Enzyme design. Structure first.
Site, short mmCIF file in Angstrom:
data_model
loop_
_atom_site.label_atom_id
_atom_site.label_comp_id
_atom_site.label_asym_id
_atom_site.label_seq_id
_atom_site.Cartn_x
_atom_site.Cartn_y
_atom_site.Cartn_z
N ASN A 80 -17.12 -15.17 -10.64
CA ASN A 80 -16.61 -13.82 -10.86
C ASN A 80 -15.66 -13.51 -9.72
O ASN A 80 -16.08 -13.30 -8.58
CB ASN A 80 -17.71 -12.78 -10.95
CG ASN A 80 -17.20 -11.46 -11.42
OD1 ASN A 80 -16.03 -11.13 -11.21
ND2 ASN A 80 -18.06 -10.68 -12.07
N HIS A 83 -21.75 -6.78 -3.78
CA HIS A 83 -22.04 -6.87 -5.20
C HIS A 83 -23.53 -6.73 -5.50
O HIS A 83 -24.39 -6.93 -4.63
CB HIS A 83 -21.50 -8.16 -5.78
CG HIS A 83 -20.01 -8.23 -5.83
ND1 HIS A 83 -19.33 -9.42 -5.88
CD2 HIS A 83 -19.08 -7.25 -5.94
CE1 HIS A 83 -18.04 -9.18 -5.97
NE2 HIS A 83 -17.85 -7.87 -6.02
C1 LIG Z 1 -17.98 -8.50 -9.44
C2 LIG Z 1 -19.17 -9.47 -9.30
O1 LIG Z 1 -19.07 -10.58 -8.87
O2 LIG Z 1 -20.41 -9.00 -9.74
C3 LIG Z 1 -21.47 -9.94 -9.60
C4 LIG Z 1 -22.76 -9.14 -9.71
C5 LIG Z 1 -21.40 -11.02 -10.75
C6 LIG Z 1 -21.64 -10.70 -12.08
C7 LIG Z 1 -21.60 -11.69 -13.08
C8 LIG Z 1 -21.33 -13.01 -12.75
C9 LIG Z 1 -21.06 -13.34 -11.41
C10 LIG Z 1 -20.71 -14.55 -10.78
C11 LIG Z 1 -20.62 -15.92 -11.47
C12 LIG Z 1 -20.04 -16.04 -12.71
C13 LIG Z 1 -20.03 -17.28 -13.33
C14 LIG Z 1 -20.63 -18.40 -12.75
C15 LIG Z 1 -20.61 -19.74 -13.47
S1 LIG Z 1 -21.96 -19.79 -14.70
N1 LIG Z 1 -22.04 -21.37 -15.34
O3 LIG Z 1 -21.78 -18.84 -15.78
O4 LIG Z 1 -23.27 -19.47 -14.14
C16 LIG Z 1 -21.25 -18.23 -11.50
F1 LIG Z 1 -21.83 -19.30 -10.86
C17 LIG Z 1 -21.25 -17.01 -10.87
C18 LIG Z 1 -20.60 -14.25 -9.43
C19 LIG Z 1 -20.12 -15.09 -8.30
O5 LIG Z 1 -19.11 -15.82 -8.53
O6 LIG Z 1 -20.56 -14.90 -7.16
N2 LIG Z 1 -20.84 -12.95 -9.23
C20 LIG Z 1 -21.13 -12.36 -10.41
ZN LIG Z 2 -20.11 -11.25 -5.49
#
Ligand SMILES: CC(=O)O[C@@H](C)c1cccc2c(-c3ccc(CS(N)(=O)=O)c(F)c3)c(C(=O)O)[nH]c12
Ligand SMILES: [Zn+2]
Ligand SMILES: [Zn+2]
Length: 233
Positions: A182, A88
């Site tokens: 995510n 990612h």
């Molecule tokens: C397909 C993919 O994953 O693309 C990557 C670049 C990506 C994009 C956008 C968000 C995430 C999250 C993510 C989302 C929400 C929260 C809780 S919050 N309170 O909003 O910060 C969090 F801790 C992490 C993650 C991950 O879960 O690793 N990866 C992300």
């Molecule tokens: Zn990821």
């Protein structure tokens, strides 16, 4: 000024923070916009003699340039190698910046394939020896471990044996997390089994660092299994 771990609203997109975790170990923290919301993310820096090993980009080209500048200001040793722990953008976005700054970039073949298929930036070098769950290899001052499918099929975790620091990457969530993040590329059914493998392999971990959010102790592992169960439902 608090010296506490920096949170999403404290870091403008484009700036990077470092946080000292242990002797010769830092996390890096940056923020990025994605689908109209702003998120923090973590990576790792591990001192490698008079050089540095980087784990994960700072989620974007500009952020990753700012990361290199922050390292030069705060540490002053060259980053010579980087490992991306899955495909990612929060892990590989910025690899082209690293490669143009002379950093040798690495990832498993699984991560390289997935990054290529997704249209994300592709680390140069393949890390063999990590294709089966439970596999581990040494890479400078760290051990790389493939726990099995979790947040993604290719996710790796990183252990710093000198400091008992476990960098879980995105397979591990912070204690305050109320969702599994995510999950677009996740295997929610396999994730608890992969976490159990991490717990069994690194029982002496003192600090556990999630892919996003605040470090803590070993409780982050059990909490992650719990929230993955709740999200799945
Ligand atoms: C397909 C993919 O994953 O693309 C990557 C670049 C990506 C994009 C956008 C968000 C995430 C999250 C993510 C989302 C929400 C929260 C809780 S919050 N309170 O909003 O910060 C969090 F801790 C992490 C993650 C991950 O879960 O690793 N990866 C992300
Ligand atoms: Zn990821
Ligand atoms: Zn992530």
């Amino acid at each position: 000024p608090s010296g506490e771990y920096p949170t999403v609203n404290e870091i403008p997109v484009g700036e990077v923070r470092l946080y000292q975790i242990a002797d010769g170990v830092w996390s890096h923290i940056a923020t990025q916009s994605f689908d109209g919301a702003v998120y923090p993310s973590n990576g790792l820096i591990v001192r490698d003699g008079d050089e540095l090993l980087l784990i994960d980009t700072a989620w974007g080209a500009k952020n990753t340039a700012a990361l290199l500048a922050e390292i030069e200001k705060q540490i002053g040793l060259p980053v010579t190698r980087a490992v991306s722990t899955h495909f990612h953008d929060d892990r590989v976005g910025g690899v082209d910046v690293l490669r143009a700054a002379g950093v040798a970039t690495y990832a498993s073949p699984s991560t390289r394939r997935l990054a290529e298929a997704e249209g994300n930036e592709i680390p140069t070098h393949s890390l063999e020896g990590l294709s089966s769950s439970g596999d581990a290899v040494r890479f400078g001052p760290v051990e790389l471990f493939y726990p099995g499918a979790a947040h993604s099929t290719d996710n790796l975790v990183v252990y710093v044996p000198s400091a008992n620091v476990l960098y879980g990457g995105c397979a591990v969530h912070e204690l305050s997390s109320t969702s599994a993040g995510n999950v677009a590329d996740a295997d929610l059914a396999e994730w608890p089994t992969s976490v159990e493998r991490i717990q069994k392999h690194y029982p002496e971990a003192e600090v556990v660092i999630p892919g996003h959010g605040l470090p803590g102790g070993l409780d982050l592992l059990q909490h992650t299994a719990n929230v993955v169960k709740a999200h799945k439902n």
